[PDB]
Nucleic acid binder design. Structure first.
Length: 83
DNA sequence: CCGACGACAGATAATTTGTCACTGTACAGTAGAATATAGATGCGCATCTATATAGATGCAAATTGAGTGGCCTTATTAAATGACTTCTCAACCAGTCA
């Protein structure tokens, strides 16, 4: 590793899944769209309100294990940060 | 015989997700509203115009009444009618007769 790369070959290497959520792609897109749509024009929707919409979709899909509030805050984290 | 690399299997923290406990912060009457501007539209009042004159005047026929100018056989007699003029208009004495 020190032959094929610099001192960064003898530091640790971070995992490939760092910054990817383990929840299903449907849920990550649902949370992303729900937040963005909830803010069109004058509306101002908080992550907690998004989490309630997640729970409402979970009842429709009969999903016994939807993303919880902390997972919604993490999914929206970079979206709030860029801003 | 020694060193380096790949296959397969095994153990491991980073990553993501979930749960749990402590916490900063909004709820407290409140931004639709004030103050300029241009730009278009409409009602009112004045200021012209173009038409429409009837009354007055000048003139030129069209008679119309009122003028004026130019052209014409004559002399005797007789009768008739109507007129004019002139003249005249004494009175008793002297000589017969039945």
């Amino acid at each position: 590793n020190w032959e094929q790369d610099g001192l960064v070959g003898l530091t640790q290497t971070s995992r490939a899944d760092k910054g990817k959520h383990r929840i299903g792609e449907f849920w990550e897109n649902f949370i992303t769209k729900t937040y963005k749509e909830g803010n069109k024009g004058s509306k101002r929707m908080t992550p907690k309100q998004v989490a309630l919409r997640v729970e409402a979709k979970a009842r429709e899909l009969k999903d016994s294990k939807p993303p919880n509030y902390k997972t919604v805050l993490r999914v929206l984290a970079p979206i709030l940060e860029k801003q």
